[PDB]
Amino acid sequence: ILGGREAEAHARPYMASVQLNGAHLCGGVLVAEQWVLSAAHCLEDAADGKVQVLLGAHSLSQPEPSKRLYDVLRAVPHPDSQPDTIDHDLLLLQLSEKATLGPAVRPLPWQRVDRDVAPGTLCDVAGWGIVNHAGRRPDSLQHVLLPVLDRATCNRRTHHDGAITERLMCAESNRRDSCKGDSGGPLVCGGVLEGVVTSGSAVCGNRKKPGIYTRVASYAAWIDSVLA
């Protein structure tokens, strides 16, 4: 997260760290007691690796009473996701057991009705991704409030040049943005999950390249089917 601040510890009890061989790989969001939603490209590399989910964390490294590392019983990338595209970039991870809930671990409601978030709406993005261009990784959860950008403008040639489908949304990315290691993390509006961070684009915090997020409401049928 570039241009943000350290989040209040455990104030986002839905926040998950998707880990590969004990190292933070992607953000994720607890959407049911036993299920974490993230981005498919997070796994599109993992292969042999041991995939786990850390819940209840603020610091990735430091002792905390609420921290709990879960194995994953199944990893379900969206069947239409593809390594060379930003489309359908969702990943559901089933935890080895239902998460132990408490003040620091709680699923977040997610939008099932397929309607766009209104342009200008301020939404919260959280994660442990890099916080500057030098690529330094923060140890504790960061977050930033970003205004939603109208899809039309986001699709302008200088921006994303027609790549933003009705299944995607954008947020402004000027000095503030999600970055490498923030992929899979949640875009939350008024306490509701609306978006998941998609593929890291080559430059973080570039105003001509708005952040791109997968619209969870657009994939509600798919999500529901997996969870059922």
Numbering used by the authors: 1 to 228
What does the paper say about this structure?
The R202A (R218A) mutation disrupts a crucial interaction responsible for maintaining the self-inhibited state of FD. The previously reported crystal structure of FD R202A determined at 2.8 Å resolution showed the catalytic site in an active configuration with residual density indicating the presence of disorder, which could not be modelled. In addition, these data yielded weak electron density for a number of surface-exposed loops, suggesting high mobility and/or multiple conformations for these regions. The new map allowed a more detailed interpretation of the active site, showing multiple conformations that indicate the coexistence of both active and inactive configurations. Despite the overall improvement in electron density, however, the surface-exposed regions corresponding to the exosite loops remained poorly defined, with only few interpretable side chains. The R202A FD variant has enhanced activity towards artificial peptides and simultaneously displays active and inactive conformations of the active site. Partially active conformations of the catalytic site in FD R202A (R218A) versus completely inactive conformations for the wild type are consistent with the observed increase in the catalytic activity of FD R202A (R218A) towards artificial peptide substrates. Biophysical analyses using thermal shift assays and circular-dichroism spectroscopy showed very similar results for wild-type and R202A (R218A) FD.
